[PDB]
Ligand binder design. Structure first.
Ligand SMILES: [Mg+2]
Ligand SMILES: [Mg+2]
Ligand SMILES: [Mg+2]
Ligand SMILES: [Mg+2]
Ligand SMILES: [Mg+2]
Ligand SMILES: [Mg+2]
Ligand SMILES: [Mg+2]
Ligand SMILES: [Mg+2]
Ligand SMILES: [Mg+2]
Ligand SMILES: [Mg+2]
Ligand SMILES: [Mg+2]
Ligand SMILES: [Mg+2]
Ligand SMILES: [Mg+2]
Ligand SMILES: [Mg+2]
Ligand SMILES: [Mg+2]
Ligand SMILES: [Mg+2]
Ligand SMILES: [Mg+2]
Ligand SMILES: [Mg+2]
Ligand SMILES: [Mg+2]
Ligand SMILES: [Mg+2]
Ligand SMILES: [Mg+2]
Ligand SMILES: [Mg+2]
Ligand SMILES: [Mg+2]
Ligand SMILES: [Mg+2]
Ligand SMILES: [Mg+2]
Ligand SMILES: [Mg+2]
Ligand SMILES: [Mg+2]
Ligand SMILES: [Mg+2]
Ligand SMILES: [Mg+2]
Ligand SMILES: [Mg+2]
Ligand SMILES: [Mg+2]
Ligand SMILES: [Mg+2]
Ligand SMILES: [Mg+2]
Ligand SMILES: [Mg+2]
Ligand SMILES: [Mg+2]
Ligand SMILES: [Mg+2]
Ligand SMILES: [Mg+2]
Ligand SMILES: [Mg+2]
Ligand SMILES: [Mg+2]
Ligand SMILES: [Mg+2]
Ligand SMILES: [Mg+2]
Ligand SMILES: [Mg+2]
Ligand SMILES: [Mg+2]
Ligand SMILES: [Mg+2]
Ligand SMILES: [Mg+2]
Ligand SMILES: [Mg+2]
Ligand SMILES: [Mg+2]
Ligand SMILES: [Mg+2]
Ligand SMILES: [Mg+2]
Ligand SMILES: [Mg+2]
Ligand SMILES: [Mg+2]
Ligand SMILES: [Mg+2]
Ligand SMILES: [Mg+2]
Ligand SMILES: [Mg+2]
Ligand SMILES: [Mg+2]
Ligand SMILES: [Mg+2]
Ligand SMILES: [Mg+2]
Ligand SMILES: [Mg+2]
Ligand SMILES: [Mg+2]
Ligand SMILES: [Mg+2]
Ligand SMILES: [Mg+2]
Ligand SMILES: [Mg+2]
Ligand SMILES: [Mg+2]
Ligand SMILES: [Mg+2]
Ligand SMILES: [Mg+2]
Ligand SMILES: [Mg+2]
Ligand SMILES: [Mg+2]
Ligand SMILES: [Mg+2]
Ligand SMILES: [Mg+2]
Ligand SMILES: [Mg+2]
Ligand SMILES: [Mg+2]
Ligand SMILES: [Mg+2]
Ligand SMILES: [Mg+2]
Ligand SMILES: [Mg+2]
Ligand SMILES: [Mg+2]
Ligand SMILES: [Mg+2]
Ligand SMILES: [Mg+2]
Ligand SMILES: [Mg+2]
Ligand SMILES: [Mg+2]
Ligand SMILES: [Mg+2]
Ligand SMILES: [Mg+2]
Ligand SMILES: [Mg+2]
Ligand SMILES: [Mg+2]
Ligand SMILES: [Mg+2]
Ligand SMILES: [Mg+2]
Ligand SMILES: [Mg+2]
Ligand SMILES: [Mg+2]
Ligand SMILES: [Mg+2]
Ligand SMILES: [Mg+2]
Ligand SMILES: [Mg+2]
Ligand SMILES: [Mg+2]
Ligand SMILES: [Mg+2]
Ligand SMILES: [Mg+2]
Ligand SMILES: [Mg+2]
Ligand SMILES: [Mg+2]
Ligand SMILES: [Mg+2]
Ligand SMILES: [Mg+2]
Ligand SMILES: [Mg+2]
Ligand SMILES: [Mg+2]
Ligand SMILES: [Mg+2]
Ligand SMILES: [Mg+2]
Ligand SMILES: [Mg+2]
Ligand SMILES: [Mg+2]
Ligand SMILES: [Mg+2]
Ligand SMILES: [Mg+2]
Ligand SMILES: [Mg+2]
Ligand SMILES: [Mg+2]
Ligand SMILES: [Mg+2]
Ligand SMILES: [Mg+2]
Ligand SMILES: [Mg+2]
Ligand SMILES: [Mg+2]
Ligand SMILES: [Mg+2]
Ligand SMILES: [Mg+2]
Ligand SMILES: [Mg+2]
Ligand SMILES: [Mg+2]
Ligand SMILES: [Mg+2]
Ligand SMILES: [Mg+2]
Ligand SMILES: [Mg+2]
Ligand SMILES: [Mg+2]
Ligand SMILES: [Mg+2]
Ligand SMILES: [Mg+2]
Ligand SMILES: [Mg+2]
Ligand SMILES: [Mg+2]
Ligand SMILES: [Mg+2]
Ligand SMILES: [Mg+2]
Lengths: 209, 148
RNA sequence: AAACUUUCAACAACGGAUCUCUUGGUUCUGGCAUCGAUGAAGAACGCAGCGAAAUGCGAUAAGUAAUGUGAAUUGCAGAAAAUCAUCGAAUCUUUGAACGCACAUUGCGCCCGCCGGUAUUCCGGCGGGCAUGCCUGUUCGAGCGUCAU
RNA sequence: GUGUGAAUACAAACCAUGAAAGUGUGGCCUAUCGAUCCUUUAGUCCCUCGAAAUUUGAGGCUAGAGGUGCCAGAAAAGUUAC
RNA sequence: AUUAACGAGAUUCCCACUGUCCCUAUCUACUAUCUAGCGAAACCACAGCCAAGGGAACGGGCUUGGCAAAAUCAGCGGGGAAAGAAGACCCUGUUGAGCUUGACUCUAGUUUGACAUUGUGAAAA
RNA sequence: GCGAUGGCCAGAAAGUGGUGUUGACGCAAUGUGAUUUCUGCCCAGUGCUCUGAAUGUCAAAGUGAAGAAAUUCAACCAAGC
RNA sequence: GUCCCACCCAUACCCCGCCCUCAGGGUAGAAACGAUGCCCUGAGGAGUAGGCGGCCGUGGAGGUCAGUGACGAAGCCUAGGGCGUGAGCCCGGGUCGAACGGCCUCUAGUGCAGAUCUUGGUGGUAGUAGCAAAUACUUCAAUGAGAACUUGAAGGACCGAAGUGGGGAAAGGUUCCAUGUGAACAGCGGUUGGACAUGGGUUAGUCGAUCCUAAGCCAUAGGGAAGUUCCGUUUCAAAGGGGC
RNA sequence: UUAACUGAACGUGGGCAUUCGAAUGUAUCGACACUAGUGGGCCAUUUUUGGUAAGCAGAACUGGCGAUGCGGGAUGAACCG
RNA sequence: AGACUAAUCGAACCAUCUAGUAGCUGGUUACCGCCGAAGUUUCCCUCAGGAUAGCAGUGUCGACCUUCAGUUUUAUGAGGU
RNA sequence: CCGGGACCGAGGACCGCGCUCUGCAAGGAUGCUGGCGUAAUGGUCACCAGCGACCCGUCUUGAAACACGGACCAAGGAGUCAAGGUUUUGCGCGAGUGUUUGGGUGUAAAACCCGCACGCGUAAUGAAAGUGAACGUAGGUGAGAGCUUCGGCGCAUCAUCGACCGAUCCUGAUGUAUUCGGAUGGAUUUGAGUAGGAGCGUUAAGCCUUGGACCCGAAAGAUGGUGAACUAUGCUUGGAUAGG
RNA sequence: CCUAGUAACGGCGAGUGAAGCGGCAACAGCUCAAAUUUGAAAGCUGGCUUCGGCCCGCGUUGUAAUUUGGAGAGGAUGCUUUGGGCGAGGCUCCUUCUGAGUUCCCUGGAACGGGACGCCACAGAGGGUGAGAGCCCCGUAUAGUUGGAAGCCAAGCCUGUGUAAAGCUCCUUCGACGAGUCGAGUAGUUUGGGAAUGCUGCUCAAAAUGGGAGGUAAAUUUCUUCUAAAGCUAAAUACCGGCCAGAGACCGAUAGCGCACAAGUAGAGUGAUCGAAAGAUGAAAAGCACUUUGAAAAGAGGGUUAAAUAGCACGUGAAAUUGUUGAAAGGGAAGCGCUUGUGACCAGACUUGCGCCCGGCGGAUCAUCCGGUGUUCUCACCGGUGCACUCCGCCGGGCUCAGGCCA
């Protein structure tokens, strides 16, 4: 029963909500458990980094179109261009995504360069120490300062384009002939009227016979 | 805290400030928004005009990302430039260079024209632009270019 | 004036409040994944030198073996560890999903083997067996369902 | 000083009537009436059907109508002497 | 409608009979009573003499009068608007339930039609 | 009311069940209530029962028409009325 | 009835003291001040429902008081005091035996006369109602601290064979027997007891169960049911026993 | 708007007081925010309406009781103070 | 006979949903200080209840502006008791 | 102008108005004297006396009520917590703000540190497509605290006339994919807008909603189980009922 | 976490209500059907076996190898790839072991209290011991160490070898891909899903660049995106039910679980079920020997103890209610307020303190000066001086001032 100038209440507590309350008194203990699990898995992956190499990926929608992030895995085309065999990639710390495609040369080239840098920085120990093969690090460059976090050492260098840039005057581009606002109005109108104009044009073309 | 509440002051006084005639019963008038078109109509009409009825059309499966186009005014357009470079431009230590501002990088899609602009050329890259904003940029001596 | 009633006080009663205590609850957090036809959970009945209960145990019955510790247990008695810890070897009555058929009966059977009574057949004692659904395999079969001689 | 019903003066228009001035926004004045939801009409180079078009269909925006007489507006028969 | 017989059924009258009564009296046993022993409960704001007045219009208390002397036993049924039991009569509640129906809304069953189960023939325009 | 391919009834269903180890002198459902003497008139109403044409009403399925199709419109109808 | 004089007293009026509230001022070249203090002045004070402010008290937490305490903490009793308007606070005396308090913050399961409130305890009633159906007891003796209701003897009585007799079924479970007995129970008593305690007592080929089938119940084969399970009991089943 | 600067409305500039144009009071002016309880009333003077009337029922103004003690009316919610 | 179905019957008993809902009855716990009501308006299946306005408290803020007034006087309107 | 009596003595150097001016009765009591120095005064308790005084809580117009609850005492006993909202306090930062989903770290549920995103705010309006806020020193007029060089400058805020943005109605230019585009200026219109940002987080209080929701209380409704030892009816198998 | 109380649903009322993107935690990929091994069923269960194999059976109505759409199959092409065994060393696990007062004095029954003097501390967490114990005892901190089992990981070594198998680079061609299934209609239910979101029943019933989806029903034309009707798979997530463990601004015997106890017990009900009350002597039983009265229970003495009014009706021991003793009142209630009176019983105040003269006693600073320090830099302190017409204190006398109660 409202009695004054109140915002209309819509608190969804008409079910037995107390039966499903989730408190979080275990937040610090769960954090401790997570840290212990991370330390254990890092120790298990003794010289290797604790994660897999991920590609750069552009977020889908028109919102977030401007930002890049880490994807799931590298495509077969990216691996082939980088020269890394498909069966060999997941065994040396590279994530592989078979269902992503490279629709653009820009993304393809960026991910290929990323893979090439990773391969250049990779140290590959031989399967057996007493008989190394030609594809392994030959025991001399096997000592170096390594990284155990590929998410930081191979992160997104710049998710967004630089918002500020300086150009000299007389290099200022000439504007759109009718103006940007008019250009947007014209493009909108053309998109609206594409079908009606098409049917009218074909009707006028066929009116002769 | 319980020691600051008025129930402590009501100790020793029968009815706890709820009155003797009206007795603080369970739910006189109903629960929630009962009687909106009835005994509570006076309240629901004095406040909240327009509580009842339908207006407008429906949009099944509305995806809010389609309508993402935050706007920034030309009065705060210059606040997007770093403070030292902005001060250099405003004092006039360039006058041979122009700043190129990426509204999409800063998180904006449309440029609006609320404020004024100093007479300094500036290139603005925006998805959308208002007519007044475009006119004001052109009069300041710059240009807006559409970038998607 | 006593008695009686009432009031006040001291002491004594009745009762178990108050104070203090707490081998108990309650709540949160962390670790772990391990019941049963190789018979579980649960139930019954028994077991101690002197126990009714609780706890423990199963006719090897307040427990046996084994390992560790190292001198008790204790209410009394007794004796030459322990009502100790641990626990990998055993025992584990009648039951119970409960399994020969039953069961409101400590009821009634069948099979194998041994030991006695003159005994393949009856009686007695002892031991081991006899549920259902389904799977794989084995063997023995049924059907003009069907194939050759 | 919320609706509803009524009512009063003026502006936009384009009409009626009188030579005019003027009068006329229903009945000389005081009564003669009706929300949300739904539906049906009227209105336009109007908006949407959200991958893109055309045509059906549907949905919106503005103004009326279909009604709640318990008339600020639930959808509603009795009996109990058990 | 009548009806013999039957009836711990309802009703009127008659004979007999009697304490139902005129109109009460008396007797017996067991209580009550007193004692030894044992030993509750209901109920209880505080309590307990009235008259009138006023007052929530029927006072134990208030006002004004009458009055008024310890502690007690057996009876008693005027009063305590005495004790039971949150009135069952009546009304209210946007509280029920049992039952009824041509109330509103449904429903088991049932009836009929269609599709499927459902195949193989012939004949009739 | 019923002659078993049934009547009345039970069941969530059933290769289910009761009546039924039954068959009209039986089973089932009602009313009145020994014997005696009788039990009159009324079928408009509500039921029940019987016929559904010269008659009207109707769903799904099916048929025809229009449509580009969704659909719309027409005829046809079993039971029930 | 009218007129006159004096007198009586409300928490009202007037003067004074004090409390609080409200209002208006003063107070730093600080010899200065719980400045949230002090000093000066004026007015005002009813109150249910209700609002606000300030304070008192309780359990627990942080800081602090170099806090109190077996030479006596807490609690409890007190016709012994002091302070505060008040809720309350402090002290004296007694009892007692192990913890506790003040100050500033923090915190709450924080303040009772009621709710036919909850649990527990205890009154008046009150030594009161009452312990009155089933005919009934008496004498002597023994026992014993104690005898109407223990026992022996005698007398008087009842049940009067559809019994107050003698045995069983259900049900009970040791109540049966012996010995002993303080309390409790036997609505009086009690030496007595179906009570309490310590020990004993139930012997079957023939009496029953066990065997048989009845009404009926549960399986099986099958069929239903999401399933717990329902029907089914001979039914649409390849379902057994006799000899050499 | 008028025939017209001729009006209407709003102003610029200048002037008024040798006296801001009745009385009394000012023991309080205005705006805002958030919210409690209440939404059974009853009594009295005067004016009344219905009723034979009622310690009856219903209204207007004001004052009271409710919410309020104190003196008086012996006794009292409202009367007098 | 609405009888009986374990002292329970116009729908047994047990546990749970369940602390079911109640515009209705009862109760609702220290002190002091200051302020201090309403039973009326409009709407409501509204009439023992709500919302709404009023009455009340608290907190402020504004120049607390030289204004305000349940009053008189003067001047000037309206009314049909 | 003279008497007679009662109650009272607030304040605490001077300061001031003054007078009858070596002083005073003038901005509040001093002087002298006596008894006692303790239960004498005074406090507490018990009782008598004069006057006064109905039983509390509650509902109610009205209670001491012949209205209800209360025999008595001890202990327990009723506006809580969470989410969301709002206004007002106090804080931090401020066109920004919010570390604690998470990561790093640790003396390990603390404290400390980190950042991408995200929420709210910074822009509204319309059903929507969409469009989207300066003529003026961010306007004019009247007030307006405070400053002022005394001429005016004018905060907050109020009233008022304008300007800008969106929507709705009008028109309707240059143009043309000839059916699209919508310039210009005009509305008795309209918006929770602009017109030199105030918000975000947090703390406390009142209030609101949902929740058991201040505490106790229905008649009912539903789901799943347990009973025919009483009783009802029936089936199977038994038993019993003088004398006339 | 956010999206978001949003889109949407709803007598559009009450109310209900997701998802994509985005940040993070955790990340893991795979195998069947659909192919002829066809120059050799190459596969598997069971039994026997010296270990080499044998036999039966399953299976061609298809058990192995190859292939799973990310492809693959077939060809070229040149490179590249692989099996076993140790294993220092480290992390685990079990096990042995851990610093310092019981020193002196007082109180006490008992120091674990108070005072004095010491010590240890990577240990001053906790508990016990006759009262608050770091050093009396168990434990507590730290990495170590005694002995042992061998669970894991692992630097690096030792040693087979390309018949076979495996990857990559290019390619004309080929390129099998799940049916009463999808889909459609209708009905019911469900969802935010709205001309129908999922699920199910019934009816109809597919196709091969086909099919599904693309949140408004339909026809037509495009586009995008995946590839159903077969299958497996850590982690991040839920949960205190089970077994262990650590904690708390929680409760403290009417509280906290119903249960701190022989509690799911005693007891009730035919049954399903219902379901309590009940902790504390003392450090130690030292749990009262013995005498006496009594039939006994018990009493009175006496004893134990720090204490028996701590005596198994046991820590403390309130109120209601009761008994005795003492005081008082009472002519149909009592209680209570204001005010005296009587009686009883009491708290305070006071019994001095200030000054000034006159004597006595004692002391050594009292002014001043010198030096050294401090400090507020001019005010003190400490030493040396002083040395009695100073200064201080204590007695005796006199005087002054004030100070209690009632007048
Ligand atoms: Mg609920
Ligand atoms: Mg009050
Ligand atoms: Mg109340
Ligand atoms: Mg109310
Ligand atoms: Mg006692
Ligand atoms: Mg066993
Ligand atoms: Mg067996
Ligand atoms: Mg077996
Ligand atoms: Mg038998
Ligand atoms: Mg033999
Ligand atoms: Mg065989
Ligand atoms: Mg054969
Ligand atoms: Mg209408
Ligand atoms: Mg309608
Ligand atoms: Mg479209
Ligand atoms: Mg309508
Ligand atoms: Mg109405
Ligand atoms: Mg007759
Ligand atoms: Mg009598
Ligand atoms: Mg007697
Ligand atoms: Mg009494
Ligand atoms: Mg009388
Ligand atoms: Mg009277
Ligand atoms: Mg009375
Ligand atoms: Mg008398
Ligand atoms: Mg009598
Ligand atoms: Mg009487
Ligand atoms: Mg009475
Ligand atoms: Mg009643
Ligand atoms: Mg009503
Ligand atoms: Mg009903
Ligand atoms: Mg009923
Ligand atoms: Mg008939
Ligand atoms: Mg007829
Ligand atoms: Mg007829
Ligand atoms: Mg027909
Ligand atoms: Mg005063
Ligand atoms: Mg007051
Ligand atoms: Mg607490
Ligand atoms: Mg003490
Ligand atoms: Mg002690
Ligand atoms: Mg409480
Ligand atoms: Mg109480
Ligand atoms: Mg009270
Ligand atoms: Mg008697
Ligand atoms: Mg009697
Ligand atoms: Mg007698
Ligand atoms: Mg007798
Ligand atoms: Mg003798
Ligand atoms: Mg006798
Ligand atoms: Mg006889
Ligand atoms: Mg006989
Ligand atoms: Mg016998
Ligand atoms: Mg017998
Ligand atoms: Mg029997
Ligand atoms: Mg004997
Ligand atoms: Mg007796
Ligand atoms: Mg006796
Ligand atoms: Mg005896
Ligand atoms: Mg004897
Ligand atoms: Mg016995
Ligand atoms: Mg026999
Ligand atoms: Mg036998
Ligand atoms: Mg069966
Ligand atoms: Mg079957
Ligand atoms: Mg109302
Ligand atoms: Mg209101
Ligand atoms: Mg009334
Ligand atoms: Mg009311
Ligand atoms: Mg009246
Ligand atoms: Mg009232
Ligand atoms: Mg008054
Ligand atoms: Mg009076
Ligand atoms: Mg009847
Ligand atoms: Mg029963
Ligand atoms: Mg009965
Ligand atoms: Mg029932
Ligand atoms: Mg029940
Ligand atoms: Mg007042
Ligand atoms: Mg209505
Ligand atoms: Mg009422
Ligand atoms: Mg007239
Ligand atoms: Mg008139
Ligand atoms: Mg005196
Ligand atoms: Mg009196
Ligand atoms: Mg009344
Ligand atoms: Mg009262
Ligand atoms: Mg009365
Ligand atoms: Mg009443
Ligand atoms: Mg009542
Ligand atoms: Mg009573
Ligand atoms: Mg307690
Ligand atoms: Mg209490
Ligand atoms: Mg409640
Ligand atoms: Mg609430
Ligand atoms: Mg209830
Ligand atoms: Mg019920
Ligand atoms: Mg219902
Ligand atoms: Mg049931
Ligand atoms: Mg029976
Ligand atoms: Mg006979
Ligand atoms: Mg829906
Ligand atoms: Mg829902
Ligand atoms: Mg040690
Ligand atoms: Mg000593
Ligand atoms: Mg010491
Ligand atoms: Mg210690
Ligand atoms: Mg597939
Ligand atoms: Mg459907
Ligand atoms: Mg369902
Ligand atoms: Mg659906
Ligand atoms: Mg679409
Ligand atoms: Mg894609
Ligand atoms: Mg699949
Ligand atoms: Mg799976
Ligand atoms: Mg308890
Ligand atoms: Mg207790
Ligand atoms: Mg309990
Ligand atoms: Mg029982
Ligand atoms: Mg005790
Ligand atoms: Mg004592
Ligand atoms: Mg003691
Ligand atoms: Mg004691
Ligand atoms: Mg007492
Ligand atoms: Mg006195």
């Amino acid at each position: 029963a409202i009695k004054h100038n109140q915002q209309i209440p819509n608190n969804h507590f008409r079910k037995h909500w107390q039966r499903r309350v989730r408190c979080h008194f275990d937040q610090p203990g769960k954090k401790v458990t997570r840290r212990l699990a991370r330390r254990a898995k890092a120790a298990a992956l003794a010289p290797r980094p604790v994660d897999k190499l991920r590609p750069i990926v552009r977020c889908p929608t028109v919102k977030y179109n401007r930002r890049t992030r880490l994807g799931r895995g590298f495509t077969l085309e990216e691996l082939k261009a980088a020269g890394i065999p498909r069966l060999l990639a997941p065994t040396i710390g590279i994530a592989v995504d078979h269902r992503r495609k490279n629709l653009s040369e820009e993304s393809l080239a960026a991910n290929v360069q990323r893979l090439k840098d990773y391969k250049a920085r990779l140290i590959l120990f031989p399967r057996k120490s007493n008989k190394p093969k030609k594809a392994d690090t030959p025991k001399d460059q096997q000592t170096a300062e390594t990284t155990t976090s590929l998410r930081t050492s191979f992160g997104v260098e710049q998710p967004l384009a630089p918002g500020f840039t300086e150009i000299s005057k007389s290099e200022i581009p000439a504007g759109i002939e009718g103006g940007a606002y008019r250009a947007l109005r014209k493009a909108r109108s053309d998109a609206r009227l594409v079908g009606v104009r098409e049917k009218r044009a074909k009707e006028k073309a066929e009116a002769e016979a | 805290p319980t020691r600051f509440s008025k129930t402590r002051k009501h100790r020793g006084h029968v009815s706890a400030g709820k009155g003797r005639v009206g007795k603080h019963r369970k739910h006189p008038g109903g629960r929630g928004m009962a009687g909106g078109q009835h005994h509570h109509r006076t309240n629901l009409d004095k406040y909240h005009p327009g509580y009842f009825g339908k207006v407008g059309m429906r949009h099944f499966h509305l995806l809010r990302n389609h309508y993402w186009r935050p706007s920034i005014n030309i009065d705060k357009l210059w606040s997007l430039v770093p403070s030292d470079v902005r001060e250099q431009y405003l004092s006039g230590q360039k006058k041979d260079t122009a700043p190129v501002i990426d509204l999409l990088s800063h998180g904006y899609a449309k440029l609006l024209g609320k404020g004024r602009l100093p007479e300094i050329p500036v290139v603005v890259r925006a998805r959308y632009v208002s007519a007044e904003a475009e006119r004001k940029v052109k009069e300041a001596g710059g240009v807006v270019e559409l970038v998607a």
